[PDB]
């Protein structure tokens, strides 16, 4: 790794600097270096890792969607043939996105998940595993598409099972997991009713547990509950 010669603590410090500078590719490379030191990550370090990669892949997904839209319009009837360029460039962005997903999935498999014994770390990493299989599923078309979809579902389901046993219903990781698994159901699995049921049940169970929280915990939980409500409003 090009980060092999840098101290773990310096990689973490530079990931925080890169975040402040909105240099998300650098932030992700610093956090990949920190993971590859082999030690478990703290709560804050897991957040740094997730923020870095979510921003990199989020930009790739946005560009992929622009290009896929142009490609679809170029393939309608009455459209003038523009040659292979739109497909080639959509494929280039798609292959880069798939590479970033495979990199994150590789960090999770070697060896973040297997060393994660506490619920807050294991649920976080299994949620990320579902997320990056979900991003692969967004662009998948081949023999492996169903297996990619099922890998996302399986990771999300394991995270859900642990979160329901080990975390309160307002825990922000449990809420964010449910938000994203609900989006998986709606957008990937063609299961809008399951998406809506999961979002509603998650919101209602969190609502009933807010009375137990401090003001700071309440702010974190209600932020995610508002996103569940936003999605429910989009879908109903």
């Amino acid at each position: 790794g090009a980060m092999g010669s840098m101290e773990r603590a310096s990689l973490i410090q530079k990931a925080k600097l890169a975040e402040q500078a909105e240099r998300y590719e650098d932030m992700a490379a610093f956090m990949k270096g920190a993971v590859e030191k082999g030690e478990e990550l703290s709560n804050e370090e897991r957040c740094l890792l997730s923020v870095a990669y979510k921003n990199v892949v989020g930009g790739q997904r946005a560009a992929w969607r622009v290009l896929s839209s142009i490609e679809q319009k170029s393939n309608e009837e009455g459209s003038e043939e523009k040659g292979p360029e739109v497909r080639e460039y959509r494929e280039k962005v798609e292959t880069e996105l798939q590479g970033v997903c495979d990199t994150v999935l590789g960090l999770l498999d070697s060896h973040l998940i297997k060393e994660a014994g506490d619920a807050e770390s294991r649920v976080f990493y299994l949620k990320m595993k579902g997320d990056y299989y979900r991003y692969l599923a967004e662009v998948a078309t081949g023999d492996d598409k169903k297996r990619i979809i099922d890998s996302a579902r399986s990771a999300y389901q394991e995270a859900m099972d642990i979160s329901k046993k080990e975390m309160p219903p307002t825990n922000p990781i449990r809420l964010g997991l449910a938000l994203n698994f609900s989006v998986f159901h709606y957008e990937i699995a063609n299961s809008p009713e399951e998406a809506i049921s999961l979002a509603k049940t998650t919101f209602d169970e969190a609502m009933a547990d807010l009375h137990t929280l401090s003001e700071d915990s309440y702010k974190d939980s209600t932020l995610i509950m508002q996103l569940l409500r936003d999605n429910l409003t989009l879908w109903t």
Partner: peptide, 6 residues
């Protein structure tokens, strides 16, 4: 109209 994820 893309849905919210975190």
């Amino acid at each position: 109209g893309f849905p919210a994820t975190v």
